Design a protein around this ligand. Structure first.
Ligand SMILES: Cc1cc2nc3c(=O)[nH]c(=O)nc-3n(C[C@H](O)[C@H](O)[C@H](O)COP(=O)(O)OP(=O)(O)OC[C@H]3O[C@@H](n4cnc5c(N)ncnc54)[C@H](O)[C@@H]3O)c2cc1C
Ligand code: FES
Ligand code: NI
Ligand code: NI
Ligand code: NI
Ligand code: NI
Length: 326
């Protein structure tokens, strides 16, 4: 156990040799800036002042090469080799209600939603807790560990994942194609979560695997009797996934699913608006004044929709929740 000190933190904390600095801080009940826990966003960046560390992923894109030369690391990609003194670069913007914990699961079902998208249902030996919008780190031995979002409302010892098999992707393709009886998880993690307050309505915008946290959040709203409008914009190049989306969300009168197809040929025998979600949203924007927006999944879409909302319209930063998968 190594002692980790920082003037930027409320108190020092211990880190086990097997934890990253970010994981250890969160288990120590500290607020710590992060978003993705996956080396892409850069939010968890630290400067190493005293001590030695192991860099889990030198080529992590969340850090510029110049920053590495200036003794910076990503806390989510950094393990201590000694007691440390660190500087936390960014201001922390939120704290999760449930802290991350390691636990085992049994895979109780696998179901293909389309050629590339499938649903896993997992069972733990104790209740699986999270805030809808959060994710769990799923390890596949000898291949890697990746974040996957809860796709269910919180419910006993269960967890649902919705995974897209990424071409040449190590972990997602293994989850798709292998028969795996047990999975070791660590979570929940994540700060982009369902919130209900003074918003006029809720708007959920995703593409591909980004559907997963949307299903948890929307189905939670349905279960909890949310009465304000819920609008889901969902895009894919594969119309089989748009069709799958129709079955994934629960039903309620105030829920509208707007599937948008960028597919080359017309499939499914159900015509959708064509193009990309950032092309379709503008004709709804007048009616979405005051919404809470949740943006989930792929970079091209989150980038395009972010510009649409904050530049072309006047949606404040505070009304938008970013869940970037990188
Ligand atoms: C917050 C968050 C939530 C997510 N939720 C979902 C979800 O609900 N459903 C879903 O399908 N996907 C989700 N993803 C994406 C998912 O975590 C994987 O990135 C995706 O499944 C592809 O992983 P892969 O191993 O198959 O592909 P790979 O291309 O083999 O690896 C995926 C990414 O990890 C990079 N990488 C390479 N080496 C390492 C390393 N040592 N450590 C970490 N990363 C490395 C790769 O360069 C690549 O960019 C989420 C991602 C994030 C950050
Ligand atoms: S939380 Fe570490 S790079 Fe995103
Ligand atoms: Ni102490
Ligand atoms: Ni404390
Ligand atoms: Ni809770
Ligand atoms: Ni455009």
């Amino acid at each position: 156990s190594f002692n980790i000190q920082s003037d930027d933190l409320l108190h020092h904390f211990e880190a086990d040799s097997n934890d990253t600095l970010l994981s250890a801080a969160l288990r120590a009940e500290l607020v710590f800036p992060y978003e993705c826990n996956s080396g892409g966003c850069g939010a968890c960046k630290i400067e190493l002042l005293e001590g030695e560390v192991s860099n889990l992923w030198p080529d992590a894109p969340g850090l510029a090469a110049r920053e590495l030369r200036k003794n910076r690391f990503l806390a989510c990609q950094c393990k201590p080799l000694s007691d440390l003194k660190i500087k936390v670069i960014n201001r922390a913007e939120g704290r999760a209600s449930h802290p991350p914990k390691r636990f085992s699961t049994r895979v109780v079902s696998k179901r293909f939603l389309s050629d590339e998208m499938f649903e896993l249902r997992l069972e733990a030996e104790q209740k699986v807790v999270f805030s809808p919008g959060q994710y769990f780190m799923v390890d596949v031995p000898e291949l890697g560990t990746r974040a996957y979002s809860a796709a269910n409302p919180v419910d006993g010892n269960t967890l649902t994942l919705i995974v897209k098999a990424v071409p040449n992707g190590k972990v997602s393709c293994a989850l798709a194609n292998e028969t795996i009886e047990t999975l070791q998880l660590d979570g929940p993690y994540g700060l982009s979560v369902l919130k209900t307050a003074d918003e006029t309505q809720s708007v959920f915008i995703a593409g591909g695997s980004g559907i997963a946290p949307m299903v948890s959040m929307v189905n939670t709203l349905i279960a909890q009797g949310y009465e304000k409008p819920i609008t889901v914009f969902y895009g894919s190049r594969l119309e089989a996934e748009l069709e799958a989306a129709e079955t994934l969300f629960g039903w309620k009168e105030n829920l509208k699913l707007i599937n948008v197809s960028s597919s080359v040929v017309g499939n499914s025998e159900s015509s959708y608006p064509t193009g990309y979600v950032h092309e379709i949203i503008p004709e709804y924007m007048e009616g979405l004044l005051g919404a809470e927006f949740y943006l989930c999944g792929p970079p091209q879409m989150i980038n395009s929709v972010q510009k649409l909302l904050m530049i072309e319209n006047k949606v404040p930063f505070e009304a938008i929740h970013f869940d970037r998968f990188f």
